[PDB]
Symmetry: C4
Amino acid sequence: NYLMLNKSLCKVEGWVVVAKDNAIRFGESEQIIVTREPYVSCDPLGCKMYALHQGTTIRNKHSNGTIHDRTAFRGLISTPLGSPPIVSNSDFLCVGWSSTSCHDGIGRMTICVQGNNDNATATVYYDRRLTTTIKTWAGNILRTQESECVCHNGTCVVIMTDGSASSQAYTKVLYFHKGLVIKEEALKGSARHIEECSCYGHNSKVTCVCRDNWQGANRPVIEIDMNAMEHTSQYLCTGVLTDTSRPSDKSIGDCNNPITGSPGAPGVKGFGFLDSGNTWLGRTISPRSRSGFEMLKIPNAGTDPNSRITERQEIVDNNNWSGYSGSFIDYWDESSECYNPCFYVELIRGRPEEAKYVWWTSNSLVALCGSPVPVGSGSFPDGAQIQYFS
Amino acid sequence: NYLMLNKSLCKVEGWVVVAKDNAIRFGESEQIIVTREPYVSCDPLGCKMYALHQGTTIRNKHSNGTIHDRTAFRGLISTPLGSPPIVSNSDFLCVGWSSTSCHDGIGRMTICVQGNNDNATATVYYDRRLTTTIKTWAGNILRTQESECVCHNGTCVVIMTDGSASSQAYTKVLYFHKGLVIKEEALKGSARHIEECSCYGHNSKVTCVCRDNWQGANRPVIEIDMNAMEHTSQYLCTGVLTDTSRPSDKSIGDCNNPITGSPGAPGVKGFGFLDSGNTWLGRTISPRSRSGFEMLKIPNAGTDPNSRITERQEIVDNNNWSGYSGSFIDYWDESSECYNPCFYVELIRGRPEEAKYVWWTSNSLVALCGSPVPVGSGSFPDGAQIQYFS
Amino acid sequence: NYLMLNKSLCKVEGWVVVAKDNAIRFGESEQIIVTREPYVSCDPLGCKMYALHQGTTIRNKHSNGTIHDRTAFRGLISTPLGSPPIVSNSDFLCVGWSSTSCHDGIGRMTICVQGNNDNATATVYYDRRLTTTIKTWAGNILRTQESECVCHNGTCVVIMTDGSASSQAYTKVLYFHKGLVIKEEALKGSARHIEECSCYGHNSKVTCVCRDNWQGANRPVIEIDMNAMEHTSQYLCTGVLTDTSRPSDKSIGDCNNPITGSPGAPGVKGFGFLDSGNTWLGRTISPRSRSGFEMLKIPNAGTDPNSRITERQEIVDNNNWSGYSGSFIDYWDESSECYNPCFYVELIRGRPEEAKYVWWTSNSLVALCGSPVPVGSGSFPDGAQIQYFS
Amino acid sequence: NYLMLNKSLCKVEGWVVVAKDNAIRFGESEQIIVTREPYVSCDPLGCKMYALHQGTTIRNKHSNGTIHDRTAFRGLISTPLGSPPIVSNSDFLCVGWSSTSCHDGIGRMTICVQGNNDNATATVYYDRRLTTTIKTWAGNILRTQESECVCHNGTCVVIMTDGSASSQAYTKVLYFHKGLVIKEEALKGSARHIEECSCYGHNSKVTCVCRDNWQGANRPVIEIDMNAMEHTSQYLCTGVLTDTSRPSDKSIGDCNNPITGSPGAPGVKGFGFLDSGNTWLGRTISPRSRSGFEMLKIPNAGTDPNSRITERQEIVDNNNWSGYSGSFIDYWDESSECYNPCFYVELIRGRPEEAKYVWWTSNSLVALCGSPVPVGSGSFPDGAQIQYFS
Ligand SMILES: *[C@@H]1O[C@H](CO)[C@@H](O[C@@H]2O[C@H](CO)[C@@H](O[C@@H]3O[C@H](CO)[C@@H](O)[C@H](O)[C@@H]3O)[C@H](O)[C@H]2NC(C)=O)[C@H](O)[C@H]1NC(C)=O
Ligand SMILES: *[C@@H]1O[C@H](CO)[C@@H](O[C@@H]2O[C@H](CO)[C@@H](O[C@@H]3O[C@H](CO)[C@@H](O)[C@H](O)[C@@H]3O)[C@H](O)[C@H]2NC(C)=O)[C@H](O)[C@H]1NC(C)=O
Ligand SMILES: *[C@@H]1O[C@H](CO)[C@@H](O[C@@H]2O[C@H](CO)[C@@H](O[C@@H]3O[C@H](CO)[C@@H](O)[C@H](O)[C@@H]3O)[C@H](O)[C@H]2NC(C)=O)[C@H](O)[C@H]1NC(C)=O
Ligand SMILES: *[C@@H]1O[C@H](CO)[C@@H](O[C@@H]2O[C@H](CO)[C@@H](O[C@@H]3O[C@H](CO)[C@@H](O)[C@H](O)[C@@H]3O)[C@H](O)[C@H]2NC(C)=O)[C@H](O)[C@H]1NC(C)=O
Ligand SMILES: *[C@@H]1O[C@H](CO)[C@@H](O[C@@H]2O[C@H](CO)[C@@H](O)[C@H](O)[C@H]2NC(C)=O)[C@H](O)[C@H]1NC(C)=O
Ligand SMILES: *[C@@H]1O[C@H](CO)[C@@H](O[C@@H]2O[C@H](CO)[C@@H](O)[C@H](O)[C@H]2NC(C)=O)[C@H](O)[C@H]1NC(C)=O
Ligand SMILES: *[C@@H]1O[C@H](CO)[C@@H](O[C@@H]2O[C@H](CO)[C@@H](O)[C@H](O)[C@H]2NC(C)=O)[C@H](O)[C@H]1NC(C)=O
Ligand SMILES: *[C@@H]1O[C@H](CO)[C@@H](O[C@@H]2O[C@H](CO)[C@@H](O)[C@H](O)[C@H]2NC(C)=O)[C@H](O)[C@H]1NC(C)=O
Ligand SMILES: *[C@@H]1O[C@H](CO)[C@@H](O)[C@H](O)[C@H]1NC(C)=O
Ligand SMILES: *[C@@H]1O[C@H](CO)[C@@H](O)[C@H](O)[C@H]1NC(C)=O
Ligand SMILES: *[C@@H]1O[C@H](CO)[C@@H](O)[C@H](O)[C@H]1NC(C)=O
Ligand SMILES: *[C@@H]1O[C@H](CO)[C@@H](O)[C@H](O)[C@H]1NC(C)=O
Ligand SMILES: [Ca+2]
Ligand SMILES: [Ca+2]
Ligand SMILES: [Ca+2]
Ligand SMILES: [Ca+2]
């Protein structure tokens, strides 16, 4: 029962919300675990939310200082999709401050990167048993996707990066079988820098839309052949820029070089589904800040430098905070002939953006799946009144 | 193992309480989720309470404002029947502000209606996977039963309404198979307006007792043939009025036209079991307010304009608040030769009725099943001391 | 896989603690459910604690007034044995203020008595489905064991009582199959009054040690043949008195008449294991108050008027509160050739006895099983500091 | 499916963290159970943390006085590995103040020692059913490992001790089958005193590294043949001392006699893996206090008096508290050809060491597994700010 990527993406005309944990709202009183860098991953038995906890809850004095990204008190938890995370409903999967996870159809592989910045090590699990470790190869924050990896025929592909965040680093494409590395490739192609890939599978291939944190306001793309276990990379061709921060959209994009001009923040994790006319990219509404979120239908964004937005759907309005976003698919819906594209938006509350109200930072989550038919509208922000926490 | 509606209703002489969550009482200190519009639905593995949460608990500053019916922070939860809802024991099923759910004997279908009032969309799930979406067709609050739907031979029937609440609207009878629409019927019959149907199955048919929110203090009834997948509608014939608000009972009712005179509130969700002499209707004791609850045995209420109350059983006394009520049956009790009629009463505490004490509104729940033999008596109100919350 | 009572009691030389929930201690801060009248019942999959909740937790303003025995906000919960009861780990089984439960080897039967004092009704469940109801027959607090019933060859025997607590009442011995009454017997024998029987099975028979609340400080005994479904009753023969309150022990007891002289309280639920020389009775250390608890080995207590205490084991010292006590056995330990006698002690804290400290009453629990070999010693009281709650 | 110890230890070059419950941090607000003497034990279905609870949570007035080691309110809980212990996720296994537990591949055996110091009794369970009891044989605190026992071919070996803590006591090696004692051996060999053995299995043998609390700063070792069910004992040969407190390391150790000079505390539970060149011992960084923790690779520490540290890995820095430590292995990882050595460190917060801040004592936990390949670095202390609790 190894998953075989034998389906194409469903056509998508709009997006509906399938889950929203309202974690910060509940967290005003209930013991909600402080998290960030969340994602969603499915398997034959259902779907779960994944997130890096901070070893504390929100209404807890230890929530002070949770703006920090790497501590010894972080780890990966999974909780039932739609539920906010508390101790009672959360599985503590591994220890670390960077992660990915995916199910090959038989067992789940999970990865936590832990340790000091200059001497970190990835811990790899298969079926909840430690199977391998991978030491840092560049000596500067070994790190991975912060969203689910993708499997085919027993092999799961994972993108990892080690080295400087602001200049040339060392990215590797890793192929796993039962939590053991069976092949590695140093990054190839024209992508200058790779961070936090959001991946999805389709017809024996995996496509990753990533984050250039060095030079690019256009997102790098990695293309993987899962039968040959080979990859290449480039940038999205469209002049419509989907990283944050970003300059204004160009009439003509660049398939092979990063587009510079990024006023402030070097990047944010994002995603995209590349399928000719059925192509959709996500992006924060603000080109400066992690606020708002919109889905853009941009036909041939992955092949056409002159491609343009043809449809748009607001998910979170610009008066509300967003954050990371990534792709996921239920690959085990045997009742559908295609893979329905889904995604999540991390809704970051607290610091740095709300530093005058609270001393913590944490997120809630909203998850969306595609519809082949025109749907309605609505905005789905975090929903908490931050002043309640002050 | 598709459910076949091959049984008649059990004879009922009285009602006993099978579950009572005492949610508001517990909610004085424990983290009870704020809910409204609850119901009960069973399947081969047991029965669960369903309810629309408000994305907060009661002892939480976000409980302020929960009188509101439609927000982006609402969704459907199921919790074990008899237990009050907390995060730890609640399944967050979908996002939205109107719902129904039912099990066909193999998989459960659930529906959440979400989005803005003028552009809402129903999200339909089967076995917890998103299967279809249904966009608003009238552009005014697409909405459904707020109690369980009913299945037969793999097909589940759902009543939905879109349009004005106070005048003519557009009601459709929807037939689902594995969460896919296989047939739709625009409302037929003499029912002028349809809201919040409470349905039950019997001998390959489904009977729905609904809420006219436009003109009628007498409840509309929908009759469905589940083999032919056709319906018609009318009103209850009895002059005994079971909506709220309502004028006094008439000596002669009207099978085909609504009975007007409703002093205040246009309606409340209610239910009834129509079975000749074995006919029972529920109603609030007050004809003005959602307070008290009584079961009335009214022989041939569905066929006889001159039908009268012959027996009565107080469930909640008139000094205590009630609310919505609806039907449910355990269709998988293979040890009984008949379907035993059951129902729930929503026990609404807080606003608007207790606005001087608290800023929230939420409910607890009591559930009753029939007995073929004379039973005892007792009143089962919410039980909380509202001033404890002030 | 119906349970067959085909084993004799194990020999018992001493008692060891197998579970202690420390519910009141935990309840100083955690949301522990207010309970009383607890017991323990096993089945093929494990053992659980059962108790009548009060529809509130201890650190909750609704805990005020929980000295009351019968409200509409009570019900039966089961929780894993050894754990204190909270919402997250508790199964809410039925609604009512008196109960019993037992597993026949295939399904569990449970009973809750609910309603007003003058018009109460027992709700009977089998495999969590409502199967029958039993209306009051005497019109004064229909009531049952408050500990587990016992099954043999698909038939479960239950002792119930209806009528005056202080004079002649109407006790019936009920035989159930799959939650349906298949035989009833009005009380027979010389037992004058029967309350709260503690029963256990052995070699196709069930023995119940009960509570005379009218005249007797000696405990009535009911003897049942489970194949013939017939019973008789008498009193324990020993002059050692095991009810509370009680006068001093007599040198000669009375097998057929109650022994009077009870200074204050008319009775307390208790238990005993009758097995010739292997005979053990439990009793509060105080003959006036529900404080302390001791196990007494009294050879032939059930047949010999001159029988005497030969061994003693303190379970709870006299400086600590006890309460109800009852029997249970793991009838599904296929690895043992005999049935090992077990029991529980209800450890009542709060009112009336601690009325100057707190406004509530609730219990914790300690459970003991026998050992055929001499064991050690230790006292196992509730353990809470009541002043912490003031 | 009885476990057969048919594998050797994996080679270990370094250690990675597989779990960290952050219990004290969470316990600032969430209802974390007060514990001490924790360990980890696995079985075919996963791994769980085990610990002796104190019958209270941290933010509970009953946490005052939890420095005490033996009360009637202690017991064993198991919780999912990686999670901090709360009531909702914890299994209350038995009552007592000393314990061990292990799975034979078919059922789990667990042991709790309970009762008064001069008359204690071990309660033995198999598959959660009480199977045997073992009365004290020396009359002074009957006690056992405080970490998992080890099974082979249906037989599980347990080390127990009864008598004086500061002079000659009576240690027995117990062999269990399905929770029944099938063989016992009085301690043999040159080990003068035995406390709190940390055991692991390999090639039909079990090796225990223990605690001499009488004379030795070098740790006693017990060697068991699981087929013959015979043992012997000695000391570690290395002059590198791994108990606490301890004098400085000697150039030459003693395989057969304890090394004295211990300035203060008579001992702490510790562990070691003895495998020639692949030999690793754990130890607190401080030779006086339970602070810090390091793993030392000491080739032939078990056979060579002149053996020396060749590699070192800091787990918890010396500015942070540690405590007990013990071994565990996942014996059911059929995908690995060897048994991977794992261990846990008890991270004790509160009294006596932090008596000026808080009135309680409790621990959090960190668990490590070996890697055959060089790994990174990082310190994993408890992480709580003790002043938050004051
Ligand atoms: C959350 O944590 C931060 C950081 O610990 C807390 O802010 C800090 O508050 C302390 C006072 O308790 C400040 O200490 C002072 O620092 C100055 C130098 O800046 C020194 O001269 C004083 O003698 C004193 O030690 C500290 O500056 C301040 N840190 C920052 C970055 O502002 C904060 O109070 C915590 N929040 C809560 C709710 O506890
Ligand atoms: C629950 O939410 C309601 C609504 O926010 C709270 O009531 C509101 O309280 C604020 C004061 O904090 C009032 O604001 C004032 O409004 C007047 C105009 O009406 C303006 O002139 C003042 O300068 C001030 O802004 C507001 O009127 C009031 N709203 C209503 C409808 O009464 C309520 O306090 C909240 N409850 C709790 C317990 O927090
Ligand atoms: C727990 O509940 C009891 C009962 O409600 C509370 O005791 C009661 O306290 C009220 C005051 O709030 C007393 O009311 C007074 O009654 C006298 C007549 O006795 C009347 O003349 C006064 O005008 C006033 O209404 C009431 O007597 C008293 N009941 C008893 C039996 O003492 C108690 O305060 C509650 N505990 C907590 C912690 O809230
Ligand atoms: C945690 O428990 C300890 C022990 O009960 C508490 O410390 C104790 O505090 C009481 C006062 O409430 C002290 O009682 C006094 O004892 C002296 C003799 O030493 C006597 O002359 C006085 O009349 C009074 O009874 C007691 O000494 C003290 N015990 C110790 C060992 O210091 C402590 O307060 C508790 N912590 C909390 C937060 O409640
Ligand atoms: C899916 O994976 C299996 C296992 O690797 C592949 O089967 C192997 O194919 C290689 C050639 O590439 C053979 O040398 C092996 O003998 C095969 N192993 C087994 C167990 O049959 C299979 O080809 C893969 N599928 C695809 C489409 O590449
Ligand atoms: C229950 O549902 C099944 C599936 O639709 C029905 O069987 C079908 O009947 C139609 C005619 O109405 C045939 O054309 C199909 O070939 C049948 N399908 C199968 C798979 O047999 C069945 O008739 C329904 N039962 C009732 C009483 O209507
Ligand atoms: C256990 O219960 C079964 C079911 O009642 C008993 O079997 C029945 O015995 C009666 C006579 O007493 C027969 O008339 C029935 O035909 C039997 N039923 C079946 C299904 O075989 C059985 O005898 C009981 N065991 C004991 C020891 O009394
Ligand atoms: C594993 O345990 C079994 C059960 O004790 C051993 O099999 C027994 O061996 C003894 C001799 O030592 C025989 O007398 C018994 O007849 C055997 N019992 C069974 C059920 O076969 C087995 O030898 C043990 N394995 C090892 C390696 O010692
Ligand atoms: C409903 O929302 C969609 C966005 O999903 C939008 O394109 C459409 O125009 C809206 N329909 C109406 C009638 O406003
Ligand atoms: C018991 O209650 C029922 C209602 O279910 C009522 O009809 C009946 O008269 C009552 N019986 C008595 C004796 O009061
Ligand atoms: C141990 O306790 C038992 C009670 O179970 C008692 O009978 C026995 O005398 C005690 N033994 C000692 C040595 O005190
Ligand atoms: C990484 O940590 C290990 C300890 O596990 C240490 O031996 C090694 O020298 C470190 N590597 C670097 C590059 O600091
Ligand atoms: Ca960038
Ligand atoms: Ca109406
Ligand atoms: Ca009596
Ligand atoms: Ca020592």
